[PDB]
């Protein structure tokens, strides 16, 4: 859809997709591992 | 909580820091003014254009700095009464557990140890602490009046002054009397000078009296 | 505790840096470059966001071919 | 006549404008040479008297916004109905409204904070509610989830609605000038058929929905075994045993018997013994005399046939004892600008939310409103609140009509002129008794800590002391208290309990409302409001008299309503704009707002809120110190401040951890604002032109050219996250105090 | 020139360009001048033939069930008031060879393609007989009007040929579609106010006159 | 309603009476046949005020006597 995706690459837009992801990713993480102080992986 | 607290006060050093060394350097001059040498060292401002050139000399990067100054001797004398007003007690445990959370700082520090402060004078009685309970009141007042000059602004208060003027000069009975000095609102850097006082004035009375009451109301 | 995170906190903050840095290299010799600023070309920067995988050694070679630093 | 008056398509809906951002304006739909136009863009975003200079284009965007606003608020009921019926214990709170905290949020369990989950009661894990929602909820006779999901589907599809209607009169069918500026036919059918209708058909819901089903949760029964609305619709044998006036139909109505109708239509003055609200019959009453009231006052403007009255024609010819050859041109100036209606309807507006608290905290009309102390302080802070807000906006909107809206050319008015020429008595007077104000309250309470702090209690504006009682409010309270025996015979009990007698409508271990008291302490405090509310009028109306001429800008209406300055000439004009008073304002409206919510939390836990014992004494919360701490400031920083947080941070633990969390990110964030309020854009462009130094020596310079706020956009940065923090303190100390205690 | 209530506006647009143009327009609904959406003076009169062509399918079809079932002719089962039949089932159902929710998207299927044709020979007259609709498209192309289209399917018979004819019965056609409008209109509130069928009610007041309408808001 | 009470005729009155005022008496497009105005619009209205008078009459005297 033409002026659409200039609209969802305006900078708001981008932010709150990019943000709403990263911030899922997060979420999904800390449900995956959850209560975390260290790193043990190595 | 020493570390976040000596972190607390590295943040207040280096901002204080930055404010004043900024203020400094760019005390001749910088791209938004150039000429700031040529107007000295306080002047109220350059305008409303180049987009706004509010708080640019030196003077105010130094009236500014002087509020992040307050905070940063705050921040280091609330660690130094604390830490020390729980070793006196004898529970640095509480300190211990308690320092590394800022609920610890306002329930077990501020809340905890203005109690008896307070109670200064309650309705029914008063205490010795009675003095520091009303200089703690009145510097939170004269720390609250400084906000009047920091936030409050000139010509909000010149344009009421005018007013009172107008009102001086035609209430009847008080024609008789006449200023000779023609009452104008404080000037800009003025009134920065004087809510900064006011601000002082209330941080060092205020904390005075919760340091000296909390510290004097059990003497650890 | 402290430095295994850091690390992976400097890499992954030096992904961002290297790819909004890398981004704004690559929409700095447009004729309007701020109208990009504000609608990010999301082909041009899902292209720039992987080239800040291997971030570091980009930065290290650009910090000895003198790339990183403007001349002014 | 009043024709309809609208055209077709024109605007073309497509996304060219939404990718072009600013398209709106000249200076904006350019590009970003700097990062102030950003906050230009969103600044003048609803601008649209700035975007478009006629009446036509403007009204058209605000009836579509007017729209979205609607679709907006229909979609927040439709989340507050739907999180009440699957993620709520409202079933467990009919069963036992009384210890069963009402919860309507539950949170995730991912970072711990599930504990914010907290031992709300009835088998249920969630955040106790303050929204009254469920008061609500019974008061309407829901006794199910299905119901609150079905009509949060309603909501939603009337936010749809109000979408697609807003779309529609913008985009493909929108009014002219012509269907706006006619307000004959707006206020005919707003009194007759918004407010007039929806009072009958609420009136008519209570009559056959709310009364039936809350007499019988009343009388004990199971809100699962109780009949459904609809079975009392149908089946005349239910509702007519419920109450037999239903037995004879309507032949009540229209032979006008309706002295046989008195079983569900009552007068009965006061509260519920039994629930603690208002008597749903007295509301059913209420509800439809307004609706006879509305739909006759409807009917008073003419708008296309012969009767009625032109406003207009009463305006031009309301002569009278003062300045009555006035009056002209009024409809004119509202009819032609958004901006003076707009500060009109949110001045009213404004104080009807502040009427609203006021009536809800004393005659409380929900079921079980009183003893949910959360519910009560959380309305009328909020209403409260809110209605400060609107009169300051109320302020900002009078302002923007003086700057912009104001032509003395082709507009006169006789009585805004007058107003204007003696502006500066206005002012001084209003100052004059702002002083006075301050002094003869503030001084007393400075007085009263001085005298109590050089251990003279004798010496005190107190009850115990010098007093200083309210005996005209002492004597309202004991004319009401009288009232209903002598000149409101109808009623069988006072309008409100909190004038007197021997009346303390206790449903459980709670009071809910016993007869406030006026001591010298409610006298002081009153002064403080009457005080605060005279300052915030100063601050306002003073930019409202001022916003276009003065003895220091006579041509600040060429700067326009929202600039910073006129330079440090003349001593200085840094505030001078009508801007920076409704900025200033708004700082008087938290001040005033502030301390009348302080006010009411401590009189209600000190006087009202508490338990009553088997014996019959009752129990404050506080203990009745409102008399004697509320006299000095010490007090408020002791026995108010000091005592009522004790809550807010003995929690950080169960439930209300939440509360103490945004007790202290909220202290942050009013000084956070403090950042902003007495600095200078100077200091932070400097600031930030090191800073981009330090960016062009890394190749990553911005296009966008950083620039510091504006010195308008400091100051709106600064009172909005002053606002935010104090009024967010002020919410996370009420409710975590209340929930904790009451 | 029979005026029922004209008025002083009402007589700008309703001059004689109508079927029943009596000129009553007192609130001003199809006023040429700003129109848009649905309140269009040519729309308007769209609305006003079809709300009185359904009505009159209504109302010779909801006391048919009646004006029959009560003289013989069909089962009493099939006997039901308008009400009775499904369509207030708080108020009756009756069981058909469907449930009443396949029977609503039938009639939502099969009005979609008889209606949605009518709607775009609303927008473009010439449609409607350009696209392969089983060829039975040939007779639904001719509009003229878009109320009165007139073509092998509608109007098999001439019936109206001359515009003296067509003229009486589209007067005719309007007359007593509002007529039957008006009579929906007491069905519905009969059968709110009294809860029985429309010919009950008429063989109430018929019989004995007694208790007409005084049985206000009582079932 | 009941034909003939005290309900009916001084209701009955008062819209008559309201008429009055507005046809011949103080009291005030659709062009009706009446000889001299009196609209279907001005006819409500004396129609609304009249029940109006009426009501407040009926139960001013339900109140007392
Ligand atoms: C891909 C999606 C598609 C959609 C959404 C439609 C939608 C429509 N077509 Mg359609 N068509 C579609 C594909 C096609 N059509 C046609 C050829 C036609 C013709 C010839 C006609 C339609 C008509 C219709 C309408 C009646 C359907 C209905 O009653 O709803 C029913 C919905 C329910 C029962 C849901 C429950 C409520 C509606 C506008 C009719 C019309 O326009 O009037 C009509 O005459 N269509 C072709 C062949 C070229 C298609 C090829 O893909
Ligand atoms: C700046 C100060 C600071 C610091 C250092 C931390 C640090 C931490 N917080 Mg705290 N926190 C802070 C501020 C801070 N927080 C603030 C301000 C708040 C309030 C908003 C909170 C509120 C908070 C809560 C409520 C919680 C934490 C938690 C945590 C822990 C995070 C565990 C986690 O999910 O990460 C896991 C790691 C990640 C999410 C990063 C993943 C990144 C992706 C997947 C890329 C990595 C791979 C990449 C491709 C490279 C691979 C190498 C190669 C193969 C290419 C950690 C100890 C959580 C915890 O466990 O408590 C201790 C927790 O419950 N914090
Ligand atoms: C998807 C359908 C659609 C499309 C394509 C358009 C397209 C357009 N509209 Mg229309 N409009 C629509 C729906 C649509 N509109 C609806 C539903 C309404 C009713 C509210 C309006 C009301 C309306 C008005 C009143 C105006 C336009 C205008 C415009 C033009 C400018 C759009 C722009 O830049 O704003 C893009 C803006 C946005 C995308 C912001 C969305 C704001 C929504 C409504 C509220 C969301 C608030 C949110 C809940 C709260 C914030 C939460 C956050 C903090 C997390 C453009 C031709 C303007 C015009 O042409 O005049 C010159 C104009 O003045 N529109
Ligand atoms: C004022 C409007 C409003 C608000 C503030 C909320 C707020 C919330 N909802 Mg509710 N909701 C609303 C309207 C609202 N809802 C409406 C209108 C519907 C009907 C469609 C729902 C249906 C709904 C469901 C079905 C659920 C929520 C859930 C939630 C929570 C998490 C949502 C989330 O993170 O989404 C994710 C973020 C994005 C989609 C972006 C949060 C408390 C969840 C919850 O409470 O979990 C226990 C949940 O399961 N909501
Ligand atoms: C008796 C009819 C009637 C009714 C009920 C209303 C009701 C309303 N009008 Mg008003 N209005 C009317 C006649 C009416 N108007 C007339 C005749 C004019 C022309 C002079 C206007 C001009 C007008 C303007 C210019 C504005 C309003 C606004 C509003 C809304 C104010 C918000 C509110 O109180 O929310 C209460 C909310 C509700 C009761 C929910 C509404 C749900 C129903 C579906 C809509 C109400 C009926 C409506 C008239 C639509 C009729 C059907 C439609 C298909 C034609 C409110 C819904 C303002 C508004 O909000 O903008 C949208 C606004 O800006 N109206
Ligand atoms: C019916 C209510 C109403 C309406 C229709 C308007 C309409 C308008 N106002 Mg008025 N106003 C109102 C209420 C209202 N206001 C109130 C209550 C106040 C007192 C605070 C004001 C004070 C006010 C001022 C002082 C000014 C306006 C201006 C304007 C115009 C442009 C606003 C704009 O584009 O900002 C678009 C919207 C924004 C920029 C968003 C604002 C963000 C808010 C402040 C933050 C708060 C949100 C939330 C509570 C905090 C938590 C957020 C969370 C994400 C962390 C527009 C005509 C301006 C004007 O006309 O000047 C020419 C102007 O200068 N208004
Ligand atoms: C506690 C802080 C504080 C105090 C005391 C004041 C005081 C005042 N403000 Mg300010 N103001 C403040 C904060 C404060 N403001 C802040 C933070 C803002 C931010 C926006 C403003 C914004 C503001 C505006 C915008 C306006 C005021 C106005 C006023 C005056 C109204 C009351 C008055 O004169 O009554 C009498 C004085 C008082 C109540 C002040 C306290 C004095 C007490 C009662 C005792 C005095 C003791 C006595 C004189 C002995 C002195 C000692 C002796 C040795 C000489 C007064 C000068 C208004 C004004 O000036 O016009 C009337 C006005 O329009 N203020
Ligand atoms: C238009 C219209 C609509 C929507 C209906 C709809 C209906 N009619 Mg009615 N009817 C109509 C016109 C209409 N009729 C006309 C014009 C006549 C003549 C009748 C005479 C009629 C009779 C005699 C009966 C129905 C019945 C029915 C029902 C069953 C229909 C069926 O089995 O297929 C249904 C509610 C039957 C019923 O009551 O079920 C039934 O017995 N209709
Ligand atoms: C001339 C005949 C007549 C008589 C005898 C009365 C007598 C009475 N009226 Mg009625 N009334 C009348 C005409 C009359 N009214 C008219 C013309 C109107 C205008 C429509 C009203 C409107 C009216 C209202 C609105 C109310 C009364 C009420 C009353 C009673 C108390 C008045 C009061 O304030 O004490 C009293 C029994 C009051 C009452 O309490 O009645 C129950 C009351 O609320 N009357
Ligand atoms: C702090 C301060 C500033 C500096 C404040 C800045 C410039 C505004 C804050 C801007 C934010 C931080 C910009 C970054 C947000 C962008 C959208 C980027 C998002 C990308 C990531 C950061 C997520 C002023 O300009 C000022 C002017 C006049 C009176 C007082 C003050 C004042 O107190
Ligand atoms: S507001 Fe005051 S300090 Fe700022 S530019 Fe204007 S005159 Fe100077």
Redesign the pocket.
Known sequence: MRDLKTYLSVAPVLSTLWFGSLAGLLIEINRLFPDALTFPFF | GDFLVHHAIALGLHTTTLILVKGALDARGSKLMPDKKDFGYSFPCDGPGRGGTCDISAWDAFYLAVFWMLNTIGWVTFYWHWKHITLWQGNVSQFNESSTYLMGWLRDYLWLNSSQLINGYNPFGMNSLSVWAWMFLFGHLVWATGFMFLISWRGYWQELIETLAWAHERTPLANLIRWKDKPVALSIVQARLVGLAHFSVGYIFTYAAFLIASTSGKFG | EFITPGILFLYIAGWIGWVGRSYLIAISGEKKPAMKEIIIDVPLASRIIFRGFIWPVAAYREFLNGDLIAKD | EVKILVDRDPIKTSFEEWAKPGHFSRTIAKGPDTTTWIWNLHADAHDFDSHTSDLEEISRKVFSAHFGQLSIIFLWLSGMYFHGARFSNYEAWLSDPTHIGPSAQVVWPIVGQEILNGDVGGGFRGIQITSGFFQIWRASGITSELQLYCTAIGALVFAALMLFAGWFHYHKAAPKLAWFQDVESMLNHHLAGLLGLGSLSWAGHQVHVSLPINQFLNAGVDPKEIPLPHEFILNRDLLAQLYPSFAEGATPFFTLNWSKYSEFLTFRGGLDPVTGGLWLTDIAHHHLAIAILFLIAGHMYRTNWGIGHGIKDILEAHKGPFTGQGHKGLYEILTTSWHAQLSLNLAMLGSLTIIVAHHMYSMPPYPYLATDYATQLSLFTHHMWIGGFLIVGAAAHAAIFMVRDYDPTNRYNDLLDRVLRHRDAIISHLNWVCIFLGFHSFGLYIHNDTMSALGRPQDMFSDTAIQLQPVFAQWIQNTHALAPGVTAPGETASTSLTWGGGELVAVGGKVALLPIPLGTADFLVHHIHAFTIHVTVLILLKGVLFARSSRLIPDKANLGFRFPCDGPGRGGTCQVSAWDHVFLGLFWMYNAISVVIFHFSWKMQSDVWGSISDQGVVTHITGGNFAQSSITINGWLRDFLWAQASQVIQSYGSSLSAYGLFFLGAHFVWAFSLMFLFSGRGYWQELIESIVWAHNKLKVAPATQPRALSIIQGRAVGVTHYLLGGIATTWAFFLARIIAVG | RPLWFASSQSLSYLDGSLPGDYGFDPLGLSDPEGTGGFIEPRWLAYGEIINGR?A???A???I??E???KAG???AE?????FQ???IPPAGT?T??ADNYT?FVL?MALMGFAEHRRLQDWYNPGSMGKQYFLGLEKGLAGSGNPAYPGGPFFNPLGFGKDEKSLKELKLKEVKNGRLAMLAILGYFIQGLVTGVGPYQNLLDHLADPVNNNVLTSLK | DFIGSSTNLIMVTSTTLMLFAGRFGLAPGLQTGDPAGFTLADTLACGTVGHIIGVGVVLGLKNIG
């Open positions: 359904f009159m399918l209504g010779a079809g909801a048919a069930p004006i029959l079932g002719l069909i089962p099939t006997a039901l008031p308008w039949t499904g369509v009756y058909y060879w029977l009639e």
